[PDB]
Structure formats: C-alpha cells, structure tokens
Design a protein around this ligand. Structure first.
Ligand SMILES: [Ca+2]
Ligand SMILES: [Ca+2]
Lengths: 219, 219, 219, 219
C-alpha cells in the first residue's frame, strides 16, 4: 500500500488541497476575532476548526510513512509537525497561550508554498553571517545592563531595578524610542552625569547596527 | 479632421499649455486654503476652477480620438482620465472627499512631464521585486494581529480590541513609534510577559525590513 | 604693489594665520556663552571680536585684489565674503539674528582648510543626483499638505489649520516622530478614517526616502 | 625560568583557563545583581571576586615578562592591563564608579577570543574613514549649539541655556527622539520661527548621516 499513498501524498492535488485548507482556516481565525460572529456561528467554526486539526494529523501521519527519517531532517516538515502538535494539546489546562499559539499554523502557508519558502530561506540564510556581531552585542547589553542595574536601580527601579529591567530599558534606548525625555532627562534630575552612560551606549549600539547593515549589503 | 487635431494634440504648444494650466491650478489650490483669500476672491477661483476642469476634459476627449485603444493602455493616461473624472463628480451628494480628492489632479504635473515620469516609473518598478517580501510581512502582521487581539483586546480594547485595531497598533510598534512607554510598558502592568510578544515581533519585522532594503540595493 | 601683496596673501603663513584666528574666535564664542565669563572678561572678548572682524575684512579686501573677478566665481570665496559681511552689520537695529548669525564665521574653518573642503564637496556633489526625487516629494508634500488642511484643520487647527501647519505636521509624521499617539490616534477620535490618509502617506514617503538612499549608494 | 613560563603562558591551557575564569566571573556578576542572592551567598562571591582579581594580576604579570615592550604596544594587552588595574583600586573612598567600572573586565572575553577580536577589529577599522565626516559634524554641532544657547536659553534653560545643554538637546533632535511635540512645538509657542532653525538642522544632520553610511558600504 506504500506506493499507493506515496502517489497520493506526492500528488499535486494533495498539496493544493492542504494549501486550500490553510487559506480557509486563516480566514476562519480572523472571523473568530469577532465576538458577534462567534455568537452567530461559533459552533460552525469550532467544529470546522477541529476537523482541520484531524485532517492535519492525518496529513502529518501520511507525510511520515512516505519519508520516515528524511522528514525529521526537514526544517519545514519539522515545523509543521511541531505546529500541529501545539494545536493538538487539549482545549484546557496548562497555559491559556496554547489555545492562542494554535494560530501559528497559519505559518504553514509559508511552508506549503515554495515561493514563500524561498524568501524565508533567503532571509534566514543571512543570520549565520551575523552571529559574530550578535554575540558581541549580547555581551555588550549584558555588561551595560549590569552596570545600569547597579548605577540606577535604587532610585529608578522601574527602569533599572533588575537585570531584566535594565535589559529592557537598554533595548528601548537602542530602538531610540522616547529615550531622552522618557528616560535620561529624568535619570539626570538625580544623576547629572547619566548622559555619560547613555550617549556612548547609543553611539556604540547604533554604530554596530550600521556595520551589521552594511555587512549584509555585501554578502 | 482627424489629422488636423492629431497635429494639434501632439503639438508642443498643446502639451506646454497643459503644463501651464496645472501649475496655475496648483497655485490656485494653495490659495483656496486661505480663509481670507476665499473671502473677496472666492468666485474668482471657483470659476477659474470649473474653467480648468472643462479644458481638461476637452483635452482628455481629444486625447482619446487620437489614441483610441492606445490611451486606455497608457498608465499615465488612464491616470489623467480617472483624476479628471473625480474632478467631475458634482460639488455635492455622496461623500465630501470627492471635493477634496480633486486636488489629486495636481499629480498630473507628474504624468505631463517626462522628467517626473522618469523618476516615478523608476520608483514604481522596484515594487514587483518586493512582493515576495511584502506578502510575507502581511501574512506575519495578520498572524500577530490575531494573537494580539485575543491576548490583549479584553483589557486594552483601544489598542488590540479589534482585528483592525491590532493591525494599527502593530504597525505603530513596527515604526517603533512610542512603542515601549505607551504600549508595551502599560501592557506589562497587567501582562508581565507581553515583552515575549513584542521584542520578537520587533526583531523579525525590523530584520525583514533591513533585508528588503538590501534587496533594493542589489538591483 | 600687486606682486608684493600677492606674496602676502598666497603665503603659507597668511593662510595658517587665518586658520589660527578662526580656532581662536571659535573658542572665544563658546566662552561668550557663559554669563559668568562675560561679567568678568566680557570687554576682553568684545574687543577681541571687533579686532578679528577688522583683520578679516582686511584679508577679504586683500584676497580680492589678488584674485579680482576670479574670486566671485569661487563658491568658497563668495561664502567668506557673505559670512564676514553678516559679521559687519552694526550691533543694533533691524533683527538681532544678525548678531547671532555672526557665529556662522566659524564655518570658515571648513572654507579655509582642505579635507573639510574635500568632504563638504563630496557631500554637496551628491545633491544634484537627488533633485529629481526631492522635487517629486515636494510636490507630494504640497498635495497632501493641501488635502490635510481642508480635511482636518477645522477640528485640529494647531496641526493642520494653515497650509504651513500641515507642512510642519506632515514633516513630523515623515520623521515618524510621535506620529501615532501624538497625532493620528487623536485625529481618529473624530475622523475614524484618518488612518486611510496617514498610513498611505507614510508608506509612500518612507519608500521614496529608501530609494533616495539606495540611489546615493549607486552613485 | 624564562622559557619555562613562556611555555606556561603561551600554553593553550593557560589561555583556556583564563577564558574559563571570565565566563565564571561574568556569571558571578549577574548574580551580584540579585539582592536576595547577596543575602545568602554574598561572602562566597566577594571572595571569589577578590581571588579572580589576583589570578588576573598574576597572569598580567606573567604576560608582561614573556612579552616586555611587545605587550605595551599591543592594544588588546594594554586594555587588559587597564581593565584589571581599575579592578585593583581598593574597594573604598574616592569615586564609586570604580567599583562599578570593575564589571568592564567582562570585555576580556572579547580580548581573549580571536573570533571576537576579529569582529571588533573589523568594526574599529571603519572609524578612520569616518573622521573627516565626524569632525565636520562636531564642528556643526558646536556652531548650532552656540546659536541655540543664545537664541532659546533664556526662556528655555532646561534645554539650552548652557553650551552643554544645547549639545544634549541638539543630539536628541538628531536622534529625532520626540523632537517636534517634545521640543520644537513648545519652542514655537514663544518663538514662532524656531522651525527655520530646526528643520534645516535636521535635513543637514540626517543628510550627512546618510552619506556616512553609504561611504562605509563601499569601502
Ligand atoms: Ca515619543
Ligand atoms: Ca519616536
């Protein structure tokens, strides 16, 4: 029976049928957003919803008999498994995020289309050539986050009171978002020289980030 | 008479007479902005306006009897057609944006001049080699916009209350506009972990957006 | 006496004497900033100022004998004339900006030192290849600035009340400064659809500005 | 004994032992952040800290005999000296930044891993090409900061008023952070024309900053 189902699975119709469900399920989830619609046709939806999840487990079952180990060595295949997996966990217990993480299956539209796969892969492929710099910054954030936590966290515990909080605030300064009136101008009402910590922080981080951009505009 | 007018239409005079009118009506529209100027000379500029609107229809009419099918296959011409059409809809009824969309005619200075046309066309032509990315992002915004609506909509309806709202807020974070003090920090007073949703959303959206830019400098 | 002075002006010493004065007057103008310093050594620095302005007029006078009509055809040369001239206008009457515009002479340190000159020129040379785009946008701003004034200026005169105000506000959106909480979210409390004007406004203007930068990396 | 130690120091084990310390002292510093952790293991960590500081001075001493003059002509080595030196100052009176600057030793993880060194060096190497621009800008900032102080600092001393305050505010405008609502809109309530000073300032400073980025993407 193997070669029977291998022909079914590898069949263009099969793929296109899967893709069709995604674009239907995608549209369905955006409708699940309307509190009105759910009162009207929620039943219709949750069942259509459960159907797809059944169908998707079947597909993932089929997809593995026809690839075995070649499957679990495929990023795209793995993705799909782990996504449908999520959607499998019952509609209760644990963390209310699971019910919500279900919408991640809409990313299957990416996986089930090569043109998308192509673009994502083009994108991802740039990452390893960034890890040298990324690592550098992460070391950097970590060093300053620590300095900040012990320089400002006592008078300013919202922003710097904790290693995590300093990390967040330092990130915010890096995105340059409301950084002066929002953070440093205040900080300075107590610590006049805080500009000595943040202007340099800003130069370094902005400089590095520009280098990172030109680095990707060469490869 | 065909060749008589085909020789009038193609005439440098005719074309430069059009450009001359555009720059006048352009100037006249910035004057119509002034409450003071409209008092005293309202009728001047209202007549002068209706005058030009005729002249432009006459032209667009003449322009067709010379080009027929060729004219309804010229981007720049179709434009000119539709932009005059809008300017034709009676100063009443329906929507009042039509009185305001009439200012779109000043975009004719772009069509009716090659130097401008060159640059516009240059710009536009970059778009198709972005749609792969643009598609990806729209799918992404749609996914996260759904998650946000069903994670923050209840306590924060102004910002995430509706699928559209989340789209708006998500756009806003993407432009990095006032995103932390103002959206995420407030959010965190209730949802300590909201940072888990927004830092990743930001990395992705900004990474992708950098790629899209380096894409446009490899062409 | 011509050849005598053509050896005074063209000399190394002359030039390096001029440069020495600039860096001295420059330092002197940062000290004129302190109200303290002025209550002590203010007389010193006002004379020192008039002194330098004398010395500078002598030089520019000299410079013209040695160069005649060739001088008024050098960008850098014309500049120094204009800048020194501004510095000549009596410490009274008309506008006080003239007293303030005097500090523009410190731009002579650029005019009168190569490499600066080189770099400035490097930069300016990039401009003409932007004029097509620049022009394009200025038409675009103008069109929307008009549109906004008549869509939003009645309920929101601070921001869109005058054509000029719209230009300012529209500029501000383009710099993406506080555009959503500061301007559009408010606007929407009255004009729910205002998002239809600003998101498109923002795509266009951002897109364009990206191209203009990609252009400057082609040239 | 020279060649004995030159075989100890130059040894892989020596280096990898140093790296192993950094990553441990690094971890230990992120824990010294916790107020809880200090109340339980504070003594453990302060001793461990004093220890590592010795180990690093022993190393730095060893490192010097094996290299002599070649060491004080190595950037990376000098660094390690100064960084360790800072950590050497007696945890006591004087400034308190010295206790905080101690966390700078984690930058040794950069100095003592060739993969970091490379990337850092790759970055630093870009700086010389920028000094022509960097100089230009500093001159520019200096000129406008002075103008601003004498134009706006009487009514707006928080922001201007001091040559330094202007510098800061001008920096802020350049990062474009809250520049319109936060600064220029207010200024205009008193000085209607302040826009004539800040819009050009913004064009120029952002122009320059674009050219600088393009110059780095070509070298
Ligand atoms: Ca802001
Ligand atoms: Ca901002």
């Amino acid at each position: 029976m193997y070669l029977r189902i291998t022909n079914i699975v590898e069949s263009s119709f099969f793929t296109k049928f899967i893709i069709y469900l995604i674009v239907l399920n995608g549209i369905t989830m955006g409708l699940e957003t309307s509190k009105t619609f759910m009162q009207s046709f929620g039943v219709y939806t949750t069942l259509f919803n459960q159907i797809v999840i059944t169908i998707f487990t079947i597909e993932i079952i089929l997809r593995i008999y026809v690839h075995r180990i070649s499957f679990f060595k495929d990023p795209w295949s793995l993705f799909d498994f782990f996504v449908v997996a999520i959607s499998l966990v019952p509609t209760s217990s644990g963390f209310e995020i699971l019910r919500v993480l279900r919408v991640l299956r809409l990313f299957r539209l990416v996986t089930a289309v090569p043109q998308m796969r192509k673009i994502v892969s083009a994108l991802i492929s740039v990452i390893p050539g960034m890890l040298s710099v990324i690592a550098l910054m992460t070391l950097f954030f970590y060093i300053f986050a620590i300095m900040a936590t012990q320089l400002f966290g006592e008078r300013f515990p919202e922003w710097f009171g904790t290693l995590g909080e300093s990390f967040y605030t330092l990130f915010q300064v890096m995105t340059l978002d409301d950084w002066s009136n929002g953070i440093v101008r205040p900080l300075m009402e107590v610590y006049p020289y805080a500009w000595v910590f943040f202007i340099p922080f800003i130069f370094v981080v902005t400089f590095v980030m520009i280098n990172l951009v030109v680095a990707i505009c060469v490869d």
